[PDB]
């Protein structure tokens, strides 16, 4: 670990002067070093984990896309043969993408999540388990994709399962957790019904708990509320 | 506009 | 060079895949892999060139200049000690943005600028040149300030003087010299009154020369005059 | 706004 020599509370500041400076890679590197310090995680230290590779890991899906697009308009008839290019850099940027991947994946494997004990931190990782499987179920196309889709599928079930016996239907982590659970069904394992009815007995079930929040937190939960009606709205 | 995921 | 084993096109088919696709560290990788075959670039080669690592350089000054922002608010009367860590994480920005910039210089220097001999190849390179010494400058603070400043300005002297001699006062690569020696007169030399006449200058000239033009050629050169325009506009 | 370079 090339941050093994450098204490944890700065590697936390310097994550936090990463983000300020858009600075993503080097924010996942501090916050993977804090991590391997082998202590558990505050709540606040969970969200910089979660950003620094969510922005890392989006800028791979998003060159992945645009190269895989490029790669299957090379395949169309009348395309005139351009060489093995296209096909390289993709599989480059996608072997990439999955070491990101894995990196999480073993991150939350030794010792996260096997120390987290209340519902929002265990909740949040299984949430990050089953996000970064799905990630991997995208450019999946071998003999592994059905146990990479039903891997991000265990994990989300899990993380439903304690967030429905744990935690209010307004709470974020919950909510956030239905979101990419829903979005999962729809264009992972092909089951756009399920990703329906989550999403909208997830918004119902909401809607009816928001009288018990105060101010801050009803705009904090009417913020996913809102993005799970848009995704209703664009598939119905 | 694309489904959204947190 | 990693990038000894890959063939000349394939390196700029790369290039141009990884501009599509944001990947500014891969296009600038490849392209650098592209220059040092040996042989002179083509114009759309130099521009993808510059495109690469314009926006590798672009995102190391603008994450330093967030960094230097906070060190200095850190050091103003009556804020709280936080330790050596916004130096060290503006130290270690730094250090990549000049490694960056002498990368660029080297690949100048050996061998782009010696084996230029047209107008159009020579005063890019020298811009080049000028702006990448441009860029060490804003960072900076010791010794060698002096002569990083007048290795900036002799390149970008070297460049205005070809330009003048073999270029007509529209030409684009002209006037985009003229904008970023103007730019390097106002805010490294001191020299806001030769900033100042520099760009009138080169504004009212193109002006006069635009009557010759194609419509295509018109919108490229009207282009950059009004970058010219709006910055007489904010310095006056 | 900001000078441009370019
Ligand atoms: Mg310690
Ligand atoms: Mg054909
Ligand atoms: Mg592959
Ligand atoms: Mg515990
Ligand atoms: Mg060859
Ligand atoms: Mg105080
Ligand atoms: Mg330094
Ligand atoms: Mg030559």
Redesign the interface.
């Known amino acids: 670990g090339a941050m093994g020599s450098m204490e944890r509370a700065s590697l936390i500041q310097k994550a936090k002067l990463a983000e300020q400076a858009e600075r993503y890679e080097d924010m996942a590197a501090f916050m993977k070093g804090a991590v391997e310090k082998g202590e558990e995680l505050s709540c606040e230290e969970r969200n910089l984990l979660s950003v620094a590779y969510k922005n890392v890991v989006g800028g791979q899906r998003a060159a992945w896309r645009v190269l895989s697009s490029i790669e299957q308009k090379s395949n169309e008839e009348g395309s005139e043969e351009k060489g093995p290019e296209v096909r390289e850099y993709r599989e480059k940027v996608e072997t990439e993408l999955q070491g990101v991947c894995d990196t999480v994946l073993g991150l939350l494997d030794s010792h996260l999540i096997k120390e987290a004990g209340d519902a929002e931190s265990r909740v949040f990782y299984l949430k990050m388990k089953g996000d970064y499987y799905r990630y991997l179920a995208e450019v999946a196309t071998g003999d592994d994709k059905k146990r990479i889709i039903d891997s991000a599928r265990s994990a989300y079930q899990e993380a439903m399962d304690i967030s429905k016996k744990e935690m209010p239907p307004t709470n974020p982590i919950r909510l956030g957790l239905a979101l990419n659970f829903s979005v999962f069904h729809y264009e992972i394992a092909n089951s756009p019904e399920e990703a329906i009815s989550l999403a909208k007995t997830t918004f119902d079930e909401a809607m009816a708990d928001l009288h018990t929040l105060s101010e801050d937190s009803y705009k904090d939960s009417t913020l996913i509320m809102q993005l799970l009606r848009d995704n209703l709205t664009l598939w119905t | ?6």
Request: proline share 0%; charged share 35%.
């Open positions: 506009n694309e489904r959204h995921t947190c």
